DNA sequence: ATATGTATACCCG
DNA sequence: TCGGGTATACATA
C-alpha cells in the first residue's frame, strides 16, 4: 500500500512549487533522496556550489510531469 | 488554518526523510521556496551512497534541523 | 481503490 | 485540548 505523506503548509512555502505546476509528488521524493543520501545530522555549515548530475532508470514509474520536466 | 499538502508515495525517498527525523514539514517547503523561486534547474548531489562511514572535506549545502548536506 | 488529493479522525511528539 | 502527520473516508479525474 502507498503512504500518503502530508506537510500541512499554508505558511512554510509549498503553495509556490504547486502554484507553478508541481506540489511535491516528484519534488518530495527527489528532495528526500538528496536529503537521504546526504543525511548527516549536524549544524553550522555554509554553501557555494551547484548540484547537477543525472542517473534516471525505467522500471518503477516516476510520473513527475509538469513544466516540460522529465527524469535525469 | 494550515494547508495539507500530501504526496501519496511510500518508499519514494519520502519515508527516509521522516525516517531520519523530519516529516518533510520544513524540508518540502524549504525545498519548495527554492524550486519555487528558482523554478528552473533543480539541484542534486551524489558521491557515495552513505554507507555509515563519512569524511567531510568541505562545504556544499546547508539543511538545518537534523540532516544537513555534507560531502561524502 | 485507481492514483493523486483533500477532509477529517486518529495518531506521534 | 494539538504542533503537525498519516490513514482512511471521501473528493476528484
Closest residue on chain B to A8 (Cα): B4
Secondary element (H or E) of residue A71? none
* Distance D8 C1' – A19 CA (angstroms): 27
| Alpha helices (H) in chain A, listed in sequence order | 14-20, 25-38
What's the rounded Cα separation, in Å, for the pair B72 and A26? Answer: 24
List the determination method.
NMR
Length of chain B: 72
**Taken in order B2, A22, A4, B14, is the CA torsion positive or negative?**
negative
- How far apart CA B48 and CA B54 sit, in angstroms, is 9
Q: Is A69 exposed, middle or buried, given 0-12, 13-18 or 19+ CB atoms closer than 10 A?
A: exposed
Residue A67 to residue A71: CA distance in whole angstroms? 12
The count of CB pairs under 8 A between chains A and B is 211
Distances (CA, A) of A16 to A67, A68, B40: 13, 17, 13
B40 touches strand D (CB under 7 A): no
Q: What are the extents of the domains in chain B?
A: 1-72
On whether the CB atoms of residues A30 and A37 are closer than 8 A, the answer is no
Rounded (to 5) percent helix, strand, coil in chain B = 30, 10, 60
How many helices (H) does chain B have, and how many strands (E)?
2, 1
Cell representation of residue A36: 537521504
Determine the Cα–Cα distance for residues B52 and B34; give it in Å rounded to an integer: 29
User: CA–CA separation, A51 vs B42, rounded Å?
Assistant: 8
Which nucleotide's C1' atom has the smallest distance to the CA of A6? D5
Amino acid at each position: 500500500m502507498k503512504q500518503r505523506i502530508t506537510v500541512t503548509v499554508d505558511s512554510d512555502s509549498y503553495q509556490l512549487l504547486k502554484a507553478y505546476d508541481v506540489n511535491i509528488s516528484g519534488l518530495v521524493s527527489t528532495t528526500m533522496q538528496n536529503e537521504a543520501r546526504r543525511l548527516r545530522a549536524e549544524r553550522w555549515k555554509v554553501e557555494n556550489q551547484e548540484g547537477m548530475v543525472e542517473v534516471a532508470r525505467f522500471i518503477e514509474m516516476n510520473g513527475s510531469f509538469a513544466d516540460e520536466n522529465k527524469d535525469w
